[PDB]
Structures are given as structure tokens and as C-alpha cells.
Amino acid sequence: RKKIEPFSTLVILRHGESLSNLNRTYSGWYDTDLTEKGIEDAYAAGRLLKSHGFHFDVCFSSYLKRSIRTMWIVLDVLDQMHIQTISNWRLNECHFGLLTGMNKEQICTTLTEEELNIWKKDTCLQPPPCAPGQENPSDDPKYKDLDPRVIPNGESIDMMWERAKPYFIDQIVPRLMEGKKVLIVAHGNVMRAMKKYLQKMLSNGSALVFKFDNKFNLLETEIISE
Amino acid sequence: PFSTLVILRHGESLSNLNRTYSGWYDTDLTEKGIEDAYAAGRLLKSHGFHFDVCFSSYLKRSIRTMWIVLDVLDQMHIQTISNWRLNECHFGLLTGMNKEQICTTLTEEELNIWDTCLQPPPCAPGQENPSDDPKYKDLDPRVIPNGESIDMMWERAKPYFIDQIVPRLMEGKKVLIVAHGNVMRAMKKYLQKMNGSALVFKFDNKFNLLETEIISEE
Amino acid sequence: PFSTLVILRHGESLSNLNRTYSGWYDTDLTEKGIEDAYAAGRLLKSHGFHFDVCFSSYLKRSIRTMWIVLDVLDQMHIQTISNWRLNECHFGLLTGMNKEQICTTLTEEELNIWKKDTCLQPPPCAPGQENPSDDPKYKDLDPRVIPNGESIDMMWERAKPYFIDQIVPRLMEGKKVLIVAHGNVMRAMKKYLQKMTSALVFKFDNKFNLLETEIISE
Amino acid sequence: RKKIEPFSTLVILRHGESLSNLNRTYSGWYDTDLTEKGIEDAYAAGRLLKSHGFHFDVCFSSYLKRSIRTMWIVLDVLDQMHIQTISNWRLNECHFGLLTGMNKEQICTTLTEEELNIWKKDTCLQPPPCAPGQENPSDDPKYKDLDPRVIPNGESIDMMWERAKPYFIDQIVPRLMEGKKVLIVAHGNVMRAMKKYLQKMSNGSALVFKFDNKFNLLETEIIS
């Protein structure tokens, strides 16, 4: 038994556990690395993609180490360490501004009850910028070449998607229109935003598979799991 | 200066001569517009500009201007890059109309606001829509505009400026853009925090704007 | 066909009209050469070609032919790439000579091998002779790689990696590729693709097997 | 004390110990991975470059895992995991053909005494192709998009350089001419051929080449 292939395919995976996630603080652009569990998560995701026979032409990540390292591990499992990889800040998680590094108690002190409800249930609430004296992740040398005016400092999910969307349209879509299979190793908020965009509208270790025809009609969205 | 950006406007198109609004309608240069391009190339040549790369929109009147300018500059070999995000506003319903028909279609209040925020209506049923051109067949159909205000035009041109132009200036390159007037004005307004004339922006290695000069044969 | 490659020779240049050998000397198209390019475009249009990308050499006669062809095809927006590795042979000392002068500069045996073979390497440019490679358009190249007197075999040895690295991967992606080329380069590519010892059309399957070679003319 | 910087810089590193190297067999294109010692070698190379202050704009590797993995480790140590990375078969080690997988005893019986001397002291001796029934590393799906006629099967060092040189000229020089700092994580034969080319001629050491805006070589430095 064999299945007719689509003209192009986009697979999106979430990165695994990071050190902040284990410490129960918000990272955003704070460049927290994978834990040992998060490294195992990446091996498991590679094995999941290998068992489905995926061969990618290109892989995208954000500028954050948790995503880049996940990508490297997954490509190792897939025997695809040689393929073209592309990293870009537009795929970063939201920049949480003042909330960077906060735990639950600190978030609860900073936001009112109504704000905290909106932050959990909606995508429109914007955090304040980093405070004077607070370490701002965007001061990292990896961002030294960006237009300083574009660099976010406190971003709602909606704002994050407004600066990720042109990257998806300008770099990922043209490759799908060439008939490529594309992998993206993403942050959860970015992955959900892309899914909503594509569908016109998920377990921790699940992957999303989007299949397209040669006119970029969406033919299928499949969730794959262990 | 560490880097330099030159922006030039294309010359007269046939719709402009006929006094109709084109937007994405792919009107070509007149013979006068062709001479405008030769004049612009001679102006840049007299100022000694050598470019590493030239950008245009997907509209022929911009592409053709670029080709003529590079020819005058003896730079026909340099990398050229064309992209829809540098296109003029898509005028939707108003596409192809003259000044009188804009008056009959928009109210006195509509034309009064016609500022940078007024979004024209989309192309009417049966109206030829310039975005149905095969040159756009590879774009994400969701992103294609149908009636754009200048504000909306800039919202989709700005990411291209930030992702393609700024990184080349940050590398120390000399960049030419052959642009539409509205796009040129939005870029000037962004950079400054606000016929044959060109704009020359000079930057240091931190992307501070050191100076803007307007050059002309006069 | 899974993929298609079209190779076209550039139109007449000024050196061909005054009957001298150009090589890298950057002679432009004549008025007849301009008409040659319009006719080539009309031929490709009548056969329904739509390209994803066009290649040229760094020499004006090739670039200008490419631009005219794309104009006729209504494909002025597509990606174009120009590169020195597709240049004609650099004729060194023989650059700018006519047939009488080459007969005077080369021996009887040498003149015979140059016409019947592809292995004779001309001497380098003489001291005081204007060398076309001192053009600023080559200022970014590794100076060690720049030829000075090239046989046809030597030209192919430096064009071949470019063909393999930039043209073949696009054909393996299923693209339609146009190359505007110089005659010796077009012949070398034909010989490579067919394994042998006015446009060419090569049609391939998805493992890069040549299914058919067609010669199209008006 | 601050030193005036060059217009552009190329750093070339060699990958560390592979499993074939530990087992004393020739690999070539055989896609042998790093050992745990070669992984430590890569961490040390990263620390060396870190201690010298290098920040790269781009990194190149071959298509072989031992080079790619070394690149990934070095960039991790450098905190440069985000930078552009490019892999290409033209930077691969020689394809050793028939000699792929052989140990010193098998090489000695395969080659005559004159051949062996030339093999050691020169760069012109070409090995035969892979035999029928021998696994040929170029049958890997990673090479499926290549023109089948370009794929080597037994290369001398001279032939390896003839196919690597165009990549150096067409991909690495243009970036240097833009003023970039470029890292290459390479194989020893490839590194030596580049040095010979650039100059016109220890374990863990790196080579640093500095250029002006006309691509004049200004300095070759060995760091360790």
C-alpha cells in the first residue's frame, strides 16, 4: 500500500522542554536552552518523523537556541544534517517585555484579574517593555544587524503574528509553491498562529502536517503522534 | 558614508499621460518616460554612483526604468531584484478611472479624506483586476490586496524594506531603488521619522541617518 | 517534460559587424542585433514558453538580448542571473583582431588548430594592450581565476561548474530555464548534454534523462 | 592595545576524530561520525576560537556528518548557533573509491611500492573506483539531486581540488569580498589545498587568513 503524495508539504513541530519551562518562568525571547527532557523530546520527534518517511528539502527555525537545537537533533535522527537550514528572528516566540523571567505569583501581582483573564483567553493583550535595569534579551549580539526600530519590546500574540506573517508569506510559501517539503521547528504560539492562518479559522509531542496542491490550496491537515 | 541608499521615481507612464489612475494596472512608460529614465541615469552617473544592487517593483514601468538607468550607469551586470511588495497601491474599484470618475464614485467626504488612510473599495464584478495577471500566480492568494490605502500599502512594503534593504545597508552596500512616488514618500517618512529629483540617504555603520540630500540636474 | 532548458544565442554585436573577434571585449548589440533579439523573443512566445529564471553572461551583448527577450515574453519581472562563468572565451592577444591579423599573428599550424580544434590557447594580452578583464565589473572576482587567453576547452572547464551548480539543480526541481548565451558556450553545453564529440530546446524527465533535443526557428 | 582589523577574514578548522580514524581505516566519502573524542575535539576547537574573539557571519561545511557535527558544536561554543550555515558536496574529502574502508595492510598490498611513495608524497595518484559489491558512499540519498556525471568515484587530491576550487571561488570569495568573517569546518586535505592555493606554494590548530578589499592575502596565522 502507498498513498499519492501532495504537490508540497509543510510540517510544523514544537520544540521540547526548556530550562525556563522547568523553572516555571516565562522566557519569550530569553534564550533558555533545552533540558535533558527537552533533548529527549527532540529525539522522539525525529523518530516520529522518520517513521512517517519524511524527507525535507529545507528546515526553518527561530533565532532562539531551544528551536535551533531541536532542529539539529531532529535532522540528526532523520539523517538529514546536510539539508539547507534557515534561522530568523521573525519566527521567535513573543517578546514578553517586563514579564520576561516572571513566575505565576509575579504575573498575578502585575496583572489585574481582568487582564490575566484576557492574557489567558485572547491574543490581544500587550505586555509592557523591559524595565530599566532588567536584562532585555534583544540586547544580544545576535540581533545587532536588525533595524533597531523593528525590534520588539513587549508583544501580544497578535503583534507577534503581524511580524511573523510576512516571513511565512515571503520565505515559506514560495518554497511550497516550488513543490518542496518544508520543516519548521517552532514555538507553540507561532505554530498555532500559522495553523489558524492556513485553515482560515494538539499534544505536547504532536506534529502538524499540511498538504497543498500546485495552486496552494490546502488539501489536508493531519496531526501525527507517537 | 558607510552605506548609501538612492531612491528614484519612475517617469511618465501611459496612464499618467492619459490622466487615469493605474495603481497595479501594468501601464508602461511613454517615450517621455523613457527619456526621463535616461535623464535620471545621467544624473546619477554625473554624481559618480556605483551600486551593488538595484530593487524595483513588479510593475513594468519600474522595471523598465531600472533597466535604462543601469544601462546609462554601465551597470547592466549588477544584481537586480523585483518584488510585488514595492508595487504602488492597488486602487481596486478606482483602477483605471480619471479624476472626474473618482469624483462621481467617492463622496465629497471620501475624496476629502483622499490623507493616507482612505481604502478604496475592491474591484467591481466584471472589472478587470490587475492582480489576476500570471506574474502574481505564485503568491499566497490571501495576501493579494484589492483596494489599498497608502497606510495599507506601507504595511506590506515595510517588511520588505526591513528584511531586504536594511540588511544590505548594514553590510555597507550602495543600494538603488526605482520606486513609485507613494512608496518613495513612505520610505522617506520612515527613515527620517516624519521629476528628475533623486533622494540620497547616507548612513553610518550603526544605521544612523547622517544626511539626506536631494539631487537634480538643477 | 519534467523540466525544460532553452539556450539562445545573442544577436549581432558591433565587433561581428566590423569582423573582429571580441571575446571578453564588451561590444554591444547593433540595431540588427536588437532586431535579432526581438525576433528570438517572438519565436519563444509563439511556442508558448514561460520561464522561471533566465541566465546571461556578464557581457552586454548577452544581457541586453536577455532583457529584450523577456520584454517580448512579458516576463520582465522574472529572476535573472548574470555571471562571468558564461562569458565567451577570453581571446587574450587576439582580442579585437580581424581574420587578417590573426593569420599574421599565428603560425600556419597554430591557425589550423584554432579553426579545426578546441585546444589552442591564445597568448595573453600584450603589454600596452587594453585587456577587457580590467573592467570594474570584474573587481569582485578572485584575481587568480580571471583568464588571459583561453582555448574553447579552457572556457568550458570554467563554465562547466556553473552549469552543474546553478542550472542542473533548477532543472531537477522541475523548472523551465532560459540561457542567453555565446555560440561557443551554447555548443559546449549541447555537447555535454548529448555526449557528442535559432534556439535549442532540451527536455528532461525527473531523473535528468534527456528525452529530446529540438531546434526551433522561424 | 587594539589592533587594526582586516577587511575580511577566513578561518579554517579540521574536524576531529572519526570512528574510521580511530579504527585506522580510510573513509573518504564514507560517512563516518565523530567519536566521543572527536566530539571533545570540536568543543576544544570552539573554545580556542572563542578565546580569540571570533564572530562569524557565515559557516561552511562539507556534506559529511563528521564536518557538519563539528560545525554545530563549534557554533554552540561560540554562541553562534543562529548564524547562516551552508553545506556542500564540493567541500567533501577525496572520494577514495576502491580504497574506501581499507586499513594500512590492505593499502600496502593494493599499491606497489612506487605507487605508495607517490600516494604519500604527492597529490596526483588517483585510486580506482568502488568495486561491484562494495558499498559506494555516493549512492547515499543525500546526493540524489546531483548531476550523475559529476559524482566522483576515486579521486586524487588534485581532482578533489579541481572540483572544490570552483566552490571556493564562487561561494567563499564573494563573501570575503563583502567584508564578511567566514568559518570553514573542513577535511585535512581540503584545508591544505586551500592554504596552498591562497599562499601560492598540529592537532587542533586553526588557520586564519586575513584579506584586504582587493583580495590580497595580508596574513596567515596559525592559532592553537
Side-chain angles (χ1 to χ4, degrees), chain A residues 147-200 202-203 205-210:
Chain A
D147 186 346
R149 308 170 60 154
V150 78
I151 295 181
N153 197 350
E155 234 183 344
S156 66
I157 289 167
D158 292 342
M159 293 164 68
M160 167 286 284
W161 175 237
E162 288 306 301
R163 51 88 172 154
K165 179 164 77 164
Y167 196 79
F168 181 88
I169 291 170
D170 287 8
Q171 298 293 338
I172 286 133
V173 174
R175 285 171 171 92
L176 296 169
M177 290 302 281
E178 290 180 295
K180 287 173 176 191
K181 302 196 186 216
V182 178
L183 177 59
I184 302 173
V185 176
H187 309 281
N189 289 145
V190 181
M191 176 188 273
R192 287 188 284 278
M194 287 183 182
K195 178 183 190 292
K196 176 177 156 197
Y197 182 71
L198 288 172
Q199 293 180 328
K200 306 172 181 174
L202 246 174
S203 162
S206 282
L208 286 173
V209 183
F210 299 94

Side-chain angles (χ1 to χ4, degrees), chain A residues 55-58 82-84 179-180, chain C residues 2 163-174 205-208, chain D residues 63 88-89 138-151:
Chain A
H55 295 275
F56 296 107
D57 301 299
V58 61
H82 59 280
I83 73 167
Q84 180 135 99
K180 287 173 176 191
Chain C
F2 176 78
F163 186 80
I164 289 169
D165 283 356
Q166 299 291 335
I167 286 84
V168 173
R170 291 175 164 95
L171 296 168
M172 296 258 207
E173 289 173 325
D205 67 23
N206 64 0
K207 297 287 95 185
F208 201 54
Chain D
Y63 253 36
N88 195 274
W89 76 270
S138 77
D139 287 329
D140 191 313
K142 73 174 90 200
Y143 307 113
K144 68 163 138 67
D145 293 311
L146 298 191
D147 187 349
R149 310 161 58 154
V150 82
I151 296 177

Side-chain angles (χ1 to χ4, degrees), chain B residues 97-98 101 105 107 110:
Chain B
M97 281 186 198
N98 56 43
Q101 282 134 24
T105 282
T107 70
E110 298 308 60

Side-chain angles (χ1 to χ4, degrees), chain A residues 54-103 106-199:
Chain A
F54 286 105
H55 295 275
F56 296 107
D57 301 299
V58 61
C59 192
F60 288 83
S61 71
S62 73
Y63 252 38
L64 304 174
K65 289 180 192 187
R66 62 196 184 255
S67 162
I68 297 164
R69 194 179 303 280
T70 297
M71 168 177 72
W72 285 1
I73 292 161
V74 167
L75 292 176
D76 194 356
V77 173
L78 284 170
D79 291 306
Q80 286 169 51
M81 299 172 63
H82 59 280
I83 73 167
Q84 180 135 99
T85 69
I86 299 168
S87 302
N88 195 272
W89 75 273
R90 287 186 182 272
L91 295 181
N92 281 11
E93 175 67 273
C94 304
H95 188 295
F96 289 138
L98 180 69
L99 312 187
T100 305
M102 280 181 186
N103 57 39
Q106 294 168 318
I107 293 286
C108 290
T109 299
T110 301
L111 284 58
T112 63
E113 167 152 358
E114 180 46 354
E115 284 170 342
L116 181 42
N117 192 231
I118 298 174
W119 202 56
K120 292 198 260 100
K121 295 326 252 164
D122 209 322
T123 59
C124 55
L125 187 65
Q126 173 186 2
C130 293
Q134 182 180 11
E135 181 172 315
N136 181 340
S138 76
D139 285 326
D140 192 310
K142 70 175 88 196
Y143 305 115
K144 67 185 169 317
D145 297 317
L146 297 189
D147 186 346
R149 308 170 60 154
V150 78
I151 295 181
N153 197 350
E155 234 183 344
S156 66
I157 289 167
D158 292 342
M159 293 164 68
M160 167 286 284
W161 175 237
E162 288 306 301
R163 51 88 172 154
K165 179 164 77 164
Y167 196 79
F168 181 88
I169 291 170
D170 287 8
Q171 298 293 338
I172 286 133
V173 174
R175 285 171 171 92
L176 296 169
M177 290 302 281
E178 290 180 295
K180 287 173 176 191
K181 302 196 186 216
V182 178
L183 177 59
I184 302 173
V185 176
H187 309 281
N189 289 145
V190 181
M191 176 188 273
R192 287 188 284 278
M194 287 183 182
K195 178 183 190 292
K196 176 177 156 197
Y197 182 71
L198 288 172
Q199 293 180 328

Side-chain angles (χ1 to χ4, degrees), chain B residues 42-90:
Chain B
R42 287 192 293 265
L43 162 70
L44 301 185
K45 184 168 137 80
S46 74
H47 287 269
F49 284 108
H50 300 97
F51 295 104
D52 299 301
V53 63
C54 189
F55 290 85
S56 78
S57 73
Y58 251 37
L59 302 172
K60 292 169 40 166
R61 65 197 181 261
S62 163
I63 294 163
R64 195 180 300 285
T65 298
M66 166 170 69
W67 285 0
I68 290 167
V69 165
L70 296 177
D71 186 6
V72 171
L73 285 171
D74 271 44
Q75 294 204 293
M76 294 162 70
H77 61 281
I78 72 170
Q79 186 177 9
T80 65
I81 299 167
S82 303
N83 194 269
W84 76 272
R85 282 191 183 266
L86 297 185
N87 281 11
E88 176 64 84
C89 306
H90 187 295

Side-chain angles (χ1 to χ4, degrees), chain B residues 12 14 20 25 40 42 49 59 105 123 128 141 155 167 215:
Chain B
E12 180 186 80
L14 179 54
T20 56
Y25 180 70
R42 287 192 293 265
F49 284 108
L59 302 172
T105 282
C123 288
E128 306 264 49
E155 286 311 296
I215 62 165

